[PDB]
Design a protein around this ligand. Structure first.
Ligand SMILES: Fc1ccc(Br)cc1
Length: 162
């Protein structure tokens, strides 16, 4: 298991524009297109992202390329963020995947997790897991949040093999 396999499980793969759990136009492996209610606005974002006139549909290769870019953008954003980088650098590789997963889903949205981040940096895993669940994130996407939290709690891939 690695971050790509983990997020592919959590996000799925759809080749036509769909709506995410918040109702926002998305495509591929969880690539947000726009928060605007305009499907035309979403289609414009898609064409700009892919570099051709897509009509709201992409190939698997294109979805995977966008996904690689999106994962990289999450990582580089963590590394540029003075709050997130020290915590990220304190984690082992499996827990770093859980961190990238959260940033991918909510963006640098993670700003409200100051207390969780402190517990993670202190390696107080059970306490961090309890704190992470006291969130809109957990209440709105509980199965995905439970998998990510279990990854932080245990440092294993058990939630994704199960
Ligand atoms: F760098 C980090 C980003 C997000 C989390 Br959650 C933990 C560390």
């Amino acid at each position: 298991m690695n971050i790509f396999e983990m997020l592919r499980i959590d996000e799925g793969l759809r080749l036509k524009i769909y709506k995410d759990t918040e109702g926002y136009y998305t495509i591929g492996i969880g690539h947000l297109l726009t928060k605007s209610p305009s499907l035309n606005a979403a289609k414009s974002e898609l064409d700009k992202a892919i570099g051709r006139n897509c009509n709201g549909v992409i190939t698997k290769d294109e979805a995977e390329k966008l996904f690689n870019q999106d994962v990289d953008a999450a990582v580089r954003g963590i590394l540029r963020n003075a709050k997130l980088k020290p915590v990220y650098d304190s984690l082992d590789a499996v827990r770093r995947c859980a961190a990238i997963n959260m940033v991918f889903q909510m963006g640098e949205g993670v700003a409200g997790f100051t207390n969780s981040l402190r517990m993670l940096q202190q390696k107080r895993w059970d306490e961090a897991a309890v704190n992470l669940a006291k969130s809109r994130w957990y209440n709105q996407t509980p199965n995905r949040a439970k998998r990510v939290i279990t990854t932080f709690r245990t440092g294993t891939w058990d939630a994704y093999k199960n």
